[PDB]
Design a protein around this motif. Structure first.
Motif, short mmCIF file in Angstrom:
data_model
loop_
_atom_site.label_atom_id
_atom_site.label_comp_id
_atom_site.label_asym_id
_atom_site.label_seq_id
_atom_site.Cartn_x
_atom_site.Cartn_y
_atom_site.Cartn_z
N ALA A 152 0.82 -1.23 0.00
CA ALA A 152 0.00 0.00 0.00
C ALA A 152 0.85 1.27 0.00
O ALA A 152 0.37 2.35 -0.39
CB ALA A 152 -0.96 0.02 1.16
N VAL A 154 3.29 1.70 -2.01
CA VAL A 154 3.56 1.99 -3.42
C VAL A 154 2.46 2.90 -3.96
O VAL A 154 1.27 2.66 -3.73
CB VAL A 154 3.65 0.70 -4.24
CG1 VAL A 154 3.78 0.98 -5.75
CG2 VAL A 154 4.83 -0.13 -3.73
N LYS A 155 2.86 3.97 -4.65
CA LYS A 155 1.93 5.07 -5.00
C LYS A 155 0.65 4.59 -5.70
O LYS A 155 -0.48 4.89 -5.24
CB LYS A 155 2.65 6.13 -5.86
CG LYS A 155 1.87 7.43 -6.05
N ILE A 157 -0.58 1.47 -6.05
CA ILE A 157 -1.29 0.34 -5.46
C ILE A 157 -2.29 0.91 -4.49
O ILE A 157 -1.90 1.41 -3.43
CB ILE A 157 -0.32 -0.66 -4.79
CG1 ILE A 157 0.69 -1.17 -5.84
CG2 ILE A 157 -1.11 -1.79 -4.11
CD1 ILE A 157 1.65 -2.29 -5.34
K LIG Z 1 -0.82 3.59 -2.43
#
Ligand SMILES: [K+]
Ligand SMILES: [K+]
Ligand SMILES: [K+]
Ligand SMILES: [K+]
Lengths: 292, 292, 292, 292
Positions: A152, A154-155, A157
């Motif tokens: 989460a 990760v931008k 995702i």
């Molecule tokens: K995210």
């Protein structure tokens, strides 16, 4: 977008096993009319397993065309090889889809570290929003909340379709992720419970044949009217269950044909036609929902 | 050959994830010298998931070339779409392989009737012997003895790799099939028990690194000398278990590199490198086996 | 009565394995001070398995005496023979207890019809309120919602302690029973979720050592303040989990002694003293909850 | 005697649930005439759960009396409290029984160390041979091979009834214990496989109604004639399965009544009468076995 009732739409076929454009148009019009929030194109219910990547892409593109900007379209993009997941995702970059639904690699049973590297690599090769998809009974692996928390960060995702049916996952994930990370049920029979615990919607098989009821149930849930929503859930519960009496999407394709939503209930091997016993079971669930 | 010790061979890779011919040659020479009955090329342990069909075919052809008729080769040909399984099988017709290893469709969870139609269709469109492969923890479906019994009536469906580790399956299947149908374990830790119950051999991961011991163990078993076979099995048991301490084939590739059998232990995503803890566990198992 | 935080109280023992009245008094005073809603006397956490029926009755009576009307007391009355369940229940008729907690027969694995006849017979021999108790991992049987619905029609069967940890049960049972049928969690780690779905409280092991936090968490839950309640839950979650690091009530008895709530952590065989590793695990969970 | 076919004998009852001497006499005569190796008196199949210790002792003493030295008797002595197990065992010292069958504590879920201390203590306070009994689906705990290995070093712990149906346990235990330690199946449907792997006999439910066939099957197995034994096993397999179609001993008591071996099929709550569907299933199994 990524809340409310999202349909895991069937890929309607002619008797030859190829996509039927007339039937797909009818379905998309139906979802627009019913207030369905978005369409997942060529997910599991859409027979992603038995379409090749070109056929898969053709269906997504056709669905996007037919939607004609009236309803958002998410592409199924899962693959058990990371290189193939990237390649498939890249087909849809700048397509018009609003995001991707990407399953944990199936069959090869990666570690939590492998899942992390798989999804991180995929996210790094696209600007599209990514929705993780966990369904251990089908894949042989289980994306745990701790790893979801990691991903989460990760931008692009931005959510998860949680299909375990294990409702403890909702708050286990919620506490590890930011408030705009989306939590969607992938288990129709427990979806309202999932929303009552803090989930934001459902990617639904039932929505294929009860789109209006599902949309209305999810609206009530979002507004906190769970008792009202539960009346609808009770009407739909036999469908939530019996749409899996035989392997999905055998029951839901038959149900679509029975309701006149698609021209044929044809599937590709190794899916086979619904049994007589299955027809009667599903017919009874449709009757109970007040749809026949 | 479809009895004795059959190795589910690794696909050795260089640092870029491409097949390493020199390493493959070394492994094949090793199996020829060590009495292995046959090689399964590009099965699960061969990273069938992360090779495309061209790379897959290339590795099988390279394996046949290097074997140079000294040891039989069986191709992994499984697919979760029946048309793809059939197409993949056609690539190997008149290749020189002796048979195919074909897994139950994974992820889409077909019914028993679906499995029957899947394998029947594959067998129809080739003269090559077909070995069925059941591994429910990986696939999400379970090919039951009744259905195996139905399929065994098909001329060129000749055996099964039974990887449940549920030893009751041996005689449940044996009673429903002819005496010439081959029962092979796909679970190293229970494989000797499987043979003692009536099984004919094992398609083995452990055999990648303990080929001679595995070959002797299987011959002793076939001769009824179970106590003698069990002494060998006890030395190999840590390996049988710890080669799955992290996802297969991560441990076995590391073990092969450690023994000098392959140049690198590189895998393709979503497989990732062995952890330090894994190295320690696997090394201890190799030492228990007398291999280091 | 039968909502909020109910403690499944330990039976504190001296070094000889007999009930320690001073320690029991200290515990009951603690629960009164903490706002615990009720006490379950000689349930599973109270070592019902290793006390004979006379010893069991002595502990319940002593607990009632010591409570001195300040906090309600529910007697554990489960037995796997219906005649014994009746006999045990009858010991407490006109005692002062406000109800009974009665487990599905363990070990003999009765049918749903057997469960129905068992609990119906018990209810027929008492005027005491009966709380059903389902915990399939310990008993070998599973009281399903349909059977709970059947039993809820019996006048003095008034609730259930649901210890499966399967949160789907809440609404499955709720829809089959009247609105004043009480739904209590028997699984500390999922109890707040259970309440968020419509549950009315918890019969808790954690409450033995975190009585005030548990009482406050359940109050917040009842008032609909789930975010506030979750902050407390997060503080307690390591205890919810680690109080089962070794078989209950080994961890919670050690924790009680460590907090100075009981004089000794003695148990009866086949429970054995906590391991060193267990002590450190539980100590860390106490530290995390801010109790040490 | 602790090899061959050992019957887990029913406790036949009149319509009031009291032991029927005349029926018991008939069963014992039947087992003497049919070659059964020994009788387990008041085990699970004997409704140990619903007899009090006085009734329990009475049935064992009556069984010894009626046997009149013609067939060895083993007493069920299991309890989930170590002190009770010890006390119960003392009741049978110098009774004439040849040994005790003692189950892992049920419901309280002791650790491996707890199980070790439990059985060690029981064995310490008697000269009678002790047979350990593992049946995790009923008890909620699993006595693992390592712990069996520890316990087998105790002089009078002489064997194990292994009822998991997990056939890997046979050689996992055999390798950790001496050649004189007895391995007995407690799972009729897998018992021949269990013997083929190294097991010495079976404590059987099926033997209540197919005593002669079971005795012959076990002797053939002990002699290594597995194909011959398996022919018998195939005729008995429906019974092996369908005697658990409803909770044991409901089916086997009905079967005994149907054959004329006992006067009534009465059980004690929470066991209830066989359903009509159950009667039909069991009768068909009896006919498959050649018994009706
Ligand atoms: K995210
Ligand atoms: K054949
Ligand atoms: K009631
Ligand atoms: K011994």
């Amino acid at each position: 977008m990524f809340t409310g009732s999202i349909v895991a739409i069937v890929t309607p076929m002619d008797e030859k096993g190829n996509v039927c454009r007339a039937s797909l148009k009818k379905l998309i019009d139906y979802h627009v009319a019913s207030g369905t929030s978005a369409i997942v194109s060529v997910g599991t219910t859409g027979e992603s397993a038995t379409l090749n990547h070109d056929e898969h892409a053709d269906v997504v593109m056709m669905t996007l065309d037919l939607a004609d900007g009236r309803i958002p379209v998410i592409a199924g993009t899962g693959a058990n090889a990371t290189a193939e997941a990237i390649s498939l995702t890249q087909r849809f970059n700048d397509s018009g889809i609003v995001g991707c639904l990407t399953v944990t690699p199936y069959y090869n049973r990666p570690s939590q570290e492998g899942l992390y590297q798989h999804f991180k690599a995929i996210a790094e090769h696209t600007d599209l929003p990514q929705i993780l998809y966990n369904v251990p009974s089908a894949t042989g692996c289980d994306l745990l909340p701790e790893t979801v928390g990691r991903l989460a960060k990760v931008k692009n995702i931005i959510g998860i379709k949680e299909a375990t049916g294990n409702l403890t996952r909702v708050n286990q994930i919620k506490e590890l992720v930011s408030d705009d990370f989306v939590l969607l049920s992938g288990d129709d029979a427990s979806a309202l419970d999932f929303m009552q615990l803090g989930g934001h919607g459902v990617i639904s098989v039932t929505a294929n044949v009860a789109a209006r009821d599902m949309a209305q149930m999810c609206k009530l849930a979002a507004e906190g009217h769970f008792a009202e929503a539960r009346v609808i859930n009770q009407r739909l519960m036999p469908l939530h269950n019996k749409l899996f009496v035989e392997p999905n999407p055998i029951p839901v394709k038959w149900a679509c044909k029975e309701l006149g939503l698609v021209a044929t209930d044809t599937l590709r091997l190794p899916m086979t036609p619904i049994t007589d016993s299955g027809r009667e079971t599903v017919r009874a669930a449709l009757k109970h929902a007040g749809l026949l």
